[PDB]
Design a binder for this molecule. Structure first.
Ligand SMILES: [Mg+2]
Ligand SMILES: [Mg+2]
Ligand SMILES: [Mg+2]
Ligand SMILES: [Mg+2]
Ligand SMILES: [Mg+2]
Ligand SMILES: [Mg+2]
Ligand SMILES: [Mg+2]
Ligand SMILES: [Zn+2]
Lengths: 135, 52, 58, 84, 50, 103, 122, 134
RNA sequence: GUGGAGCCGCCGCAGGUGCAGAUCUUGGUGGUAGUAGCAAAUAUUCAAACGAGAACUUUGAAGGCCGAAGUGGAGAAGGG
RNA sequence: AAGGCUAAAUACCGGCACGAGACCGAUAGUCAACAAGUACCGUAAGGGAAAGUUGAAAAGAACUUUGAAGAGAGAGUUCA
RNA sequence: CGCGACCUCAGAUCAGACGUGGCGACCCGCUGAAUUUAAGCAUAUUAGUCAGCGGAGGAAAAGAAACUAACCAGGAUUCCCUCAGUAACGGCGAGUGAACAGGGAAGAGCCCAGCGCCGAAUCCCCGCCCCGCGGGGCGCGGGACAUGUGGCGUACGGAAG
RNA sequence: CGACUCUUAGCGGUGGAUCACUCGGCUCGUGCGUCGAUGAAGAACGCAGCUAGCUGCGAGAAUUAAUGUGAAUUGCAGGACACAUUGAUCAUCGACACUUCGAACGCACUUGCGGCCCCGGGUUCCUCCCGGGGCUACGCCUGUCUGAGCGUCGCUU
């Protein structure tokens, strides 16, 4: 997990925020692993990834990537979706199956903390004052 | 800008006021005392034929 | 003359030679503080300055 | 000695003008700029001052090329010339 | 300084060319309201700061 | 802070609520907009009917509402099978199909 | 003596540059006439020759870039200033052909089950 | 009453489009009526004024049956100068006083190849207005 | 009387609705007041010239000071 | 379930164009009606003003006179 | 010892492409306080908001069920009116607080891996041409990719022979 | 008598209040919803006959071509009026052009220092000789060429 990057463990707040050393970083490690793979290769588009070993210190993932500008990708209209410019850098927005597990979305009674759009798109709609015109 | 600009009136009062607004436009005193010079005109609910 | 500020003395020395058909002995430049480069073109003693100035107007 | 006589020694400069924004904020020892952070690739801007964006956002300079892009938009970016 | 670099003295030439009064033929123009240069810098009072 | 006989109240205005306000001044401006999204769709289609396909008879759930009849999503396969029409030809006839509905 | 660009297009390349160097010669000797006492008439002539000297340079560059665009017409790999500009994001859209590609699973889905037109009274 | 919802009716934006006008719009807005003799021969109402029209002034301090040609048309100050109406200065030099072309009546047009084509188009577009009355 | 282009009464409506104070905000002006003051490092004087005009400018003479770690002669930084 | 795409209804105090208002009227309204993110301030981050109005038209007071000039006294322009 | 293959890797100003930075009102991923309230204050509240950081687009995100339901059952998402200041949370204090039916806006659905089947039936690049405008190809011959699996018919509503 | 002081009023000054105006806001709304290696945003410098600023521009520098328009620009000069040439001006803007820094890109940032390739003249030139032109950043994809390996192995000697 992550250690809170704060000098000498002094967080300077109320005692519920003395959390230096039990903090857990709510996005997954595989989503971290895809994120620094598609960051190095910003010309590449990232599809998803999987597990290929873990030691005690390191964890190894094979990340699969897609060149949007090669003609075996820019033809074949069942592959043309990724070369459409809304899919630029999918893991920095949290769109892949490794990364979309961390947003907590899905249908159900267990997942309607995000029942409009995303997590904070629910929060903005729950916490807006919807005063009408004739009220 | 979220001042209550707009007002509701329930519709039987809208229709109450619109029957009271038409019935006073037939009395010659109320329509002339609002200023409309209606001296020389004939019969007060003026009806010209549908060719107009 | 007053010379464009990107011009070195080899560029000046051919530019007075080809426009005015005269030999140039040496050039000494200067950036005068209005911002334009001033050049002191000395002629070879074969030529003269007081009549080459006459055929260029002054 | 704290005040006006210690203003006598103010003789050598900290900051000179930056190559990217022209500011007198290119620090000479640290070699970074105060306003833009010059040797860094990204621009130094902060939400905790909405004026310091407003001093330097788009629309405050010449816009040498977005005048033409915003003008070619309303005809669909033609390439071939006019008829006579 | 007398030891100045080229980007200093082409900055100082730019500040020196623009310290000049309005020509007298602009006060006669139609619909102006500038009547003296208000951005005038004097070398003792207001200093450039490098 | 309280007084004589009145209500004890929990207004939820302890949060920065002036930023998330939604004022409906464009609401006549959008009601005349999505009329135009219907009219310029209805003449856009065909003599095909407006307001989309035909919907089923569907009874509501949840004891309060189970005594009434609602329009559903799609007719479905079981009901399409008996009527004789194909399950993928049905939506170019103008008949919506909901395959996840059970009879 | 006016210079019109519709006149200049019927000239050859060797004639424009001889006539370009000419206007640079009068423009240099009017700058001598400005730095001396000068003449009222001469100073005015200074603007109408330097806009005249841009008409000659425009016809040189327009009869070069469109002389050279007819060289590369119908070639793969034509240069960058000859490719269309249009905006940065326009060059990365697919094209009017490859956006029409439909997979063969979805071609037979179209020809077997097309969209019909219909109406509902009788 | 204005019905087109894309053209202004406010005071402040119609003035701002008037005094910041481009100089080709500004010849259009500096138009003057033709004389009653001459608007029957050409069946056109008014014309944008140019440099050598014979013209007389119909309202102001200098007015009344004084046909005399224009000599200079300031567009920037919305002013024509006419060769006869002048003013002596305190110096004794005579200057042209300037008057607005709406207060002024053309009595002889200056025809060129273009002032045929402007009149013919402004006159042809009036018979279609007559042809609508069926 | 000035001034030079708009404005008011009545019936309803709507507020950014009326000041003497907040060591109130901004702007303006008084009394104090022709007053305090124009006093660190010894010092000026005579004639003349230019000039509408000279205790102060220039020049000539006299008297003096800095007195070679300078009130002298050259630079770095800074100023532009 | 642990693979993937997908339009519409929705959000928009940045942008390019527009329309309007029971709004504000140069100490107001944007900080900014004007050479305003301007002069100017701070080593720098940053701070950040003042400032609208001749007349219908410059017709912006020729000429005389006093004075070295500013400044007057006459004359004149303009409905003023 | 030489040679050939292949695998793992290098280099190059290789041929042809791509990514960078800005703007950031709205949108997506994380990170994240304290003032304040509780008449004190620590859990709580402020607030998963301010600031910080990264990614986009004309919209984004979501989205065709590992659902809601518990009865005569509904049937992707998003938005509205309700549900509701309600069930619930909480020094059970201050405070906080969703959803499902129902009414509407809009409505649209699909594809792969796998299991088998078809002699890789498939794609990229180069070269000259059918023949063309404003350039993209189905047609021709070579170099690669590819059996460690390209393409076709297929997807849970079943499918194939 | 005079002066001084005080209270009212006229007249003059100081001051810029009030009133009347308003090419500016502000609010709401509609429609579109477009940057950048093909060098953006921004910065610096420069450019006018007389021009310091704002504005507009980029050594083709207060604009060039084209189309539309059809006799001006104007503070003063100056010049072509030609328009059954081609035509002033202004708008539009689709052709061309667009210095320096900047993601900034040969390397550095001190206008500091190169490296190949080609061109015009000088040693008719290799082995560092003037000017000009082209090229040279990092990441990374597909392909090509070159080749590392007591990696796996084949055929060999
Ligand atoms: Mg209510
Ligand atoms: Mg308005
Ligand atoms: Mg975009
Ligand atoms: Mg004031
Ligand atoms: Mg032109
Ligand atoms: Mg070179
Ligand atoms: Mg670098
Ligand atoms: Zn900087």
């Amino acid at each position: 997990g992550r250690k809170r990057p704060v000098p000498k463990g002094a967080t300077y707040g109320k005692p519920v925020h003395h959390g230096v050393n039990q903090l857990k970083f709510a996005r997954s490690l595989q989503s971290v692993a895809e994120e620094r793979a598609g960051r190095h290769c910003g010309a590449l588009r990232v599809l998803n990834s999987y597990w290929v070993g873990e030691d005690s210190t390191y964890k190894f993932f094979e990340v699969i990537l897609i060149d949007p500008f090669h003609k075996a990708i820019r033809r074949n209209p069942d592959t043309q979706w990724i070369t459409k410019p809304v899919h630029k850098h999918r893991e920095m927005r949290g769109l892949t199956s490794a990364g979309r597990k961390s947003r907590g979305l899905g249908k159900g009674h267990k997942f309607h903390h995000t029942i409009g759009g995303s997590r904070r798109a629910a929060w903005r709609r729950r916490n807006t004052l919807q005063l009408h015109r004739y009220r | 800008t979220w001042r209550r600009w707009h007002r509701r009136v329930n519709t039987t009062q809208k229709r109450y006021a619109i029957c009271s607004a038409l019935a006073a436009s037939a009395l010659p005193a109320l329509v002339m005392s609002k200023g409309h010079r209606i001296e020389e005109v004939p019969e007060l609910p003026l009806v010209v034929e549908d060719k107009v | 003359f007053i010379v464009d500020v990107k011009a070195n003395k080899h560029q000046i020395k051919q530019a007075v030679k080809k426009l005015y058909d005269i030999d140039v002995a040496k050039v000494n430049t200067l950036i005068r503080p209005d911002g334009e480069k001033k050049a002191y073109v000395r002629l070879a003693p074969d030529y003269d300055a007081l009549d080459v100035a006459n055929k260029i107007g002054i | 000695t704290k005040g006006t006589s210690s203003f006598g020694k103010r003789r050598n400069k900290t900051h000179t003008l930056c190559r990217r924004c022209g500011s007198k904020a290119y620090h000479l020892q640290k070699s970074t700029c105060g306003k833009c952070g010059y040797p860094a690739k990204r621009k130094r801007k902060y939400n905790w001052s909405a004026k310091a964006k407003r001093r330097n956002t788009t629309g405050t300079g010449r816009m040498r090329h977005l005048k033409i892009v915003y003008r070619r938009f309303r005809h669909g970016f033609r390439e071939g010339t006019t008829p006579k | 300084s007398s030891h100045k670099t080229f980007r200093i003295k082409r900055f100082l030439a730019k500040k020196q060319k623009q310290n000049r009064p309005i020509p007298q033929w602009i006060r006669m123009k139609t619909g102006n309201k500038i009547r003296y240069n208000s951005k005038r810098r004097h070398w003792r009072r207001t200093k450039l700061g490098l | 802070a309280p007084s004589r006989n009145g209500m004890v109240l929990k207004p939820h205005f302890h949060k920065d609520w002036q930023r998330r306000v939604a004022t409906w001044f464009n609401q006549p401006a959008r009601k005349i907009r999505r009329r135009k999204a219907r009219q310029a769709k209805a003449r856009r289609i065909a003599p095909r009917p407006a307001s989309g396909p035909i919907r089923p008879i569907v009874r509501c759930p949840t004891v309060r509402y189970h005594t009434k009849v609602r329009a559903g999503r799609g007719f479905s396969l079981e009901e399409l099978r008996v009527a004789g029409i194909h399950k993928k030809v049905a939506r170019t006839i103008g008949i919506s199909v909901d395959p996840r509905r059970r009879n | 003596a006016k210079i019109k660009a519709r006149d200049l297009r019927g000239k050859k390349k060797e004639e424009l540059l001889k006539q370009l160097d000419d206007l640079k010669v009068e423009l240099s000797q009017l700058r001598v006439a400005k730095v001396t006492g000068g003449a009222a008439s001469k100073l005015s002539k200074i603007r109408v020759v330097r806009k005249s000297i841009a008409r000659v340079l425009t016809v040189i560059n327009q009869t070069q870039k469109e002389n050279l665009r007819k060289f590369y017409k119908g070639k793969k790999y034509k240069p960058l200033d000859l490719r269309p500009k249009k905006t940065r994001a326009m060059r990365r859209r697919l094209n009017k052909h490859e956006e029409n590609l439909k997979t063969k699973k979805q071609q037979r889905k179209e020809r077997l089950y097309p969209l019909r037109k219909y109406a509902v009274k009788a | 009453m204005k019905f087109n919802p894309f053209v202004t009716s406010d005071r402040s934006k119609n003035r701002k489009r008037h005094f910041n006008a481009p100089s080709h719009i500004r010849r259009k807005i500096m138009s003057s009526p033709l004389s009653k003799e001459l608007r029957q021969k050409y069946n056109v109402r008014s014309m944008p004024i140019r440099k050598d029209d014979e013209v007389q002034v119909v309202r102001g301090h200098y007015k009344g049956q004084q046909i005399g040609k224009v000599v200079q048309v300031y567009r920037k100050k919305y002013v024509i100068y006419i060769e006869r109406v002048q003013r002596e200065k305190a110096n004794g030099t005579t200057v042209h006083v300037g008057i607005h072309p709406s207060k002024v009546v053309i009595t002889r047009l200056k025809l060129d190849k273009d002032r045929k084509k402007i009149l013919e188009r402004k006159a042809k577009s009036r018979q279609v207005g007559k042809e609508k009355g069926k």
